[model samples]
Target: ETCENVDCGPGKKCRMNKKNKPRCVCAPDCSNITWKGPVCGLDGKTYRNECALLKARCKEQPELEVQYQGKCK
Candidate 1:
């Protein structure tokens, strides 16, 4: 077992999604689902790369380091 602070997996880039999107999701897959048809997914514009999703998430919800400063656990 290994540990990495930034282990998001291969082919995934850290980033944020569209503004006010709330949470990060597979952009390509998310947007592609907009249409309910087979042809809707058989295209480059319909699919999102895994890395892009990660990148978007990072941008929207970057690394957050919180400290109690003064509090009880």
Candidate 2:
């Protein structure tokens, strides 16, 4: 099974849907499209690149982390 909740930044919260997935309903554009650049995030989510992950982390206000280039392994 997938995650039961969304881990948004402190200033934000997650909105659960019928499918049981969490999304940042309060934060606008707190999303990553798609790219070839590989990067990992503190939330254990894969990002397109440093910039891609940065966009998401920046909104959290000094709480994001870079695990590694690949997975958190």
Candidate 3:
């Protein structure tokens, strides 16, 4: 067979909205979740704290990364 799906990863998947652009979306969970520094999410947003970033990360999964230590610029 041929591949017809864009497999993201353990923490992400493909999303097709009305826009028609497939993007990776994170899984859902919370480790009861930390503190470190400011973080940036792939959603083009900045979080106040690591916990806050992780909170969103838990939802965004692999799509989100610790872009930086300070606010996302």
Candidate 4:
């Protein structure tokens, strides 16, 4: 059982379920994620981190993309 062919959408990840079948599930929580740095989204907003940006991507901003690895200029 492999997830090689699984294509998970935004805010999701492919993993092997208990039945040994590949499934798409919600991405892990970013609550306890370590601080890396801020990332600027194409929307001209600075996310707390990449995880935070992805969180927004999965929820409301599907078109959101990372513009750079710092505050928006």
Q: Write the per-residue lDDT of candidate 4 for residues 1-73, one digit (tens) a residue.
A: 7899778975589989889999887684666555569989999999988888877887678898788887888
The deviation in Å at residue 51 for candidate 2 is: 0.2
Every candidate's lDDT: 0.32, 0.61, 0.61, 0.81
Worst 10 contiguous positions by lDDT, candidate 4: 26-35
What are the per-model C-alpha RMSD values against the true structure? 18.8, 9.4, 7.8, 7.2
How high is each candidate's TM-score?
0.20, 0.42, 0.40, 0.54
TM-score of 1: 0.20
User: Could you tell me the lDDT of residue 66 within candidate 3?
Assistant: 66
Q: Of 1 and 2, which scores higher on TM-score?
A: 2
How many pairs of residues collide in model 1? 16
Show how many residue pairs clash in every candidate, following the order shown: 16, 0, 1, 0
Error at 67, model 2, angstroms? 0.4
Candidate 3 displacement at residue 52 in angstroms? 1.2
Clashing pairs in 2: none
| Model 3, span 1-73: residue lDDT tens | 2124778776555677667777776644434434455666666677776566654766645466666666777
Q: Pick the candidate with the highest TM-score.
A: 4
Candidate 3 pairs with clashing backbones:
26-60
Q: Quote the positional error of residue 33 for candidate 2 in Å.
A: 19
The most accurate candidate by lDDT is 4
* Collision pairs in model 4: none
Name the regions of candidate 2 deviating beyond 4 angstroms.
1-36, 71-73
